[PDB]
């Protein structure tokens, strides 16, 4: 599959618009992304904002500015001519049912499949909660793609200036287990379709991990053997330094 990369310039741009647009009472701020989707790795080097207002009790009322789309063409094209509109982004933690109708408005300006980017403004997740989706023909479905961080001279300089293993993964595995656990509890309470089909894929593919235990410990002892021959070398860098430090002490006594 393809890849999606979001620069920290786009990250901080979407996260700052929360307090800039006075977004509260669980609302969203619809932006726009600028990148090159022609390659296999989608990289967004520019982003902007758009005014968005939606009623809480009415999902059929939403405001969008299509005039600002033509305003960035008179600006960005005079600086970077390789910037095009590959889609938009949202500041909400989870998508709603209105995103299906938003794709009809941007399909004329975008020259390719629009990209759906979701950025969590609450920062309540672990790692990179920012996710991306690609709308294709199912009627329509959203194909998720992994999100990475852009590494370039135009970003890491500003990141290092403002700012300056398994234990982290343990908290990440709990998020995947509790997500499926709470989904079953909410399902049984509201009743007594794609999740039920893919749910048993994990159960039939951790009692099954105990059959290879005989072959698992075969390569585990090699790790300790590699550490045993390395442990002897560890003393070679120590005792040798003790001999050198002893010769330094003999010169300090004569002083």
């Amino acid at each position: 599959h393809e890849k999606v990369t979001i620069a920290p310039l786009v990250l901080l741009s979407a996260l700052d618009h929360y307090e800039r647009t006075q977004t509260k009472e669980n609302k969203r701020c619809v932006g726009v992304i600028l990148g090159d989707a022609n390659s296999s790795t989608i990289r967004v080097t520019n982003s902007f904002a758009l005014p968005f207002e939606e009623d809480e009790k009415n999902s059929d009322v939403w405001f969008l500015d299509h005039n600002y789309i033509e305003n960035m063409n008179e600006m960005c094209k005079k600086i970077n001519a390789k910037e095009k509109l590959i889609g938009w982004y949202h500041s909400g933690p989870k998508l709603r049912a209105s995103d299906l109708k938003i794709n009809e408005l941007f399909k004329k300006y975008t020259q390719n499949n629009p990209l759906l980017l979701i950025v969590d403004v609450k920062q309540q997740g672990v790692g990179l909660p920012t996710d991306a989706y690609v709308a294709i023909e199912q009627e329509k479905t959203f194909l998720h793609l992994p999100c990475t961080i852009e590494a370039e001279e135009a970003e890491e300089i500003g990141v290092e200036h403002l700012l300056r293993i398994r234990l982290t993964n343990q908290l990440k595995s709990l998020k995947g287990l509790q997500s499926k656990l709470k989904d079953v509890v909410e399902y049984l309470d509201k009743v007594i379709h794609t999740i039920l089909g893919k749910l048993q894929d994990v159960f039939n593919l951790n009692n099954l991990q105990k059959a290879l235990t005989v072959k698992t410990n075969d390569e585990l002892m090699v790790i300790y053997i590699s550490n045993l021959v390395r442990s002897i070398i560890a003393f070679d860098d120590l005792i040798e330094n003790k001999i050198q430090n002893k010769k330094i002490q003999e010169q300090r006594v004569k002083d």
Binding site: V214, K215, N217, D218, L220, M221, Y224
Partner: protein
């Protein structure tokens, strides 16, 4: 020493080596040696020989760990 030489050895074949007393004497001295996990073998009286239960192949176990 004799257990490592012969995995399966008869009852009267050991007495011809160490010049022991009787056949019942050598049979009951082997059961005492496996108390501490030294010989690690079994004695089959119906078949008439002592078979070693150690197949080695400890690379698949957790003991070296």
């Amino acid at each position: 020493i004799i257990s490592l030489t012969y995995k399966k050895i008869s009852l009267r074949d050991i007495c011809l080596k160490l010049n022991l007393d009787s056949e019942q004497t050598v049979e009951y001295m082997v059961s005492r040696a496996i108390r501490d996990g030294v010989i690690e073998a079994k004695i089959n009286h119906e078949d008439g020989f002592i078979e070693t239960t150690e197949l080695l192949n400890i690379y698949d176990s957790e003991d070296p760990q």
